[PDB]
Each structure stands twice: as structure tokens, then as C-alpha cells.
Design a binder for this molecule. Structure first.
Ligand code: CA
Ligand code: CA
Ligand code: CA
Ligand code: CA
Lengths: 36, 148, 36
């Protein structure tokens, strides 16, 4: 029975790290090209 | 995980000393009142008793250093918050196996209404996987939730 | 051997705690005086 506000805080925390993780993940896109 | 540094604790001890003018290790109404009067504050006797009573968690009639430590730490007196934290674990730990796996995390992320790759989940789990056991434990989850 | 500035901080530290108790005291006023 978590409040919506509490859930939102949890989501924001996860969202915040997700964006940072996504940025780092997208960084490796450079090495996703193995064509030569 | 989060602990006060020696410098902060030293300041805390000094703060106790600030109220404990006689240095007897005990702070009473007279000492507290004297400190407030020294600060130019003029509290009533009832208010002074209320101040001690409110922060007198042990109910020993006095405010000990531990009581002051939490007092000046501005810690919440709501211990029912532990239940709320536990409930969050229950929500995330849908399978109730006591642990949060990548699949369980993926379901939470999926419920957000976004599509992400398994690799992203694995990377997120990996980063939050301090012990590197391939699973997220309670301590690891707490670190994730206390992340800012 | 602390600077007076530290002593001044106590006023803020006590004021913050004092306000919390004062608000609690204020809540008793509501129980004795209520109108609607
Ligand atoms: Ca004393
Ligand atoms: Ca006590
Ligand atoms: Ca689980
Ligand atoms: Ca782990």
C-alpha cells in the first residue's frame, strides 16, 4: 500500500539512474559497428 | 552504509558539551534552560519540560548523548516507516523469493510503459550489483533507493 | 573553546526544535477552541 507520491519518488530515482545508464549504454553504440 | 564522520561526531560531542555546561554528562532542565537563556531565549518551565519529554525517547527523565545525537540529526520518530520500506520490497519482490532478479526489475521497468533491452537491465543490475553475485540483495536495493 | 558563531548556531538548532514543540502546544489550542 505505497502512496502514489512514494511510488513516484521510487520511479524518479530509477528513472534518474536509467537515464544515466542509457547515456552510458548509448556510448557503446560506437563499438556496436563491427562492419569493416 | 551511511555513518557520521569523525569530524561530524566530534562536532556532535561538542554540541552536547554546549548544552552540558557543567560537563557532568547529564543535561537537565536547569542546564537546558540556562543554555536557552544564554542564547537570549526565554522559554517557560512547561515548555522546557516538554522539550525534554518530547525528546526523552528512553523516558529516563533525561536527555542522554544518544538521544541528543538523534535529536540534532533530525531523525524521524516515525518507526512505522520501516513497514513502508518493507512494503516497497514486497512490491518489487513480486515472486517473494526474498531477492530481486533482473527479470523482476525488468517487470518494474516494463510497468513504466517503456521498452528497454535486456542488456540495459543487465547493465543496471550489474551496476547496482555491488557484491557481483548476479542478484540484488536488500542492502544493494537500499543503495539503489537511497541513490540520488 | 568554540567560536561564538557556533553558539549562535545553537539558537537556530534550539529554535528549530522549539518550534516543533511549540506547534505541538498549538495543537492543544485547537482541542480547546474549535469553530466551523
Ligand atoms: Ca550536565
Ligand atoms: Ca532520556
Ligand atoms: Ca524476488
Ligand atoms: Ca548482488
Amino acid at each position: 500500500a505505497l502512496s502514489k507520491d512514494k511510488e513516484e519518488e521510487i520511479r524518479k530515482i530509477l528513472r534518474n539512474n536509467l537515464q544515466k545508464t542509457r547515456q552510458r549504454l548509448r556510448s557503446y553504440n560506437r563499438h556496436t559497428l563491427v562492419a569493416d | 552504509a551511511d555513518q557520521l564522520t569523525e569530524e561530524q561526531i566530534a562536532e556532535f560531542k561538542e554540541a552536547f558539551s554546549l548544552f552540558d555546561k557543567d560537563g557532568d554528562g547529564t543535561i537537565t532542565t536547569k542546564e537546558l534552560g540556562t543554555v536557552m537563556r544564554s542564547l537570549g531565549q526565554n522559554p517557560t518551565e512547561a515548555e522546557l519540560q516538554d522539550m525534554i519529554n518530547e525528546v526523552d525517547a528512553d523516558g529516563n527523565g533525561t536527555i542522554d548523548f544518544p538521544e541528543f545525537l538523534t535529536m540534532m540529526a533530525r531523525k524521524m520518530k516515525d518507526t512505522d516507516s520501516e513497514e513502508e520500506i518493507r512494503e516497497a520490497f514486497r512490491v518489487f519482490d513480486k515472486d517473494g523469493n526474498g531477492y530481486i532478479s533482473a527479470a523482476e526489475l525488468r517487470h518494474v521497468m516494463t510497468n513504466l510503459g517503456e521498452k528497454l533491452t535486456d542488456e540495459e537491465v543487465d547493465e543496471m543490475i550489474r551496476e547496482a550489483d555491488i557484491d557481483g553475485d548476479g542478484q540484488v540483495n536488500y542492502e544493494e536495493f537500499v543503495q539503489m533507493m537511497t541513490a540520488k
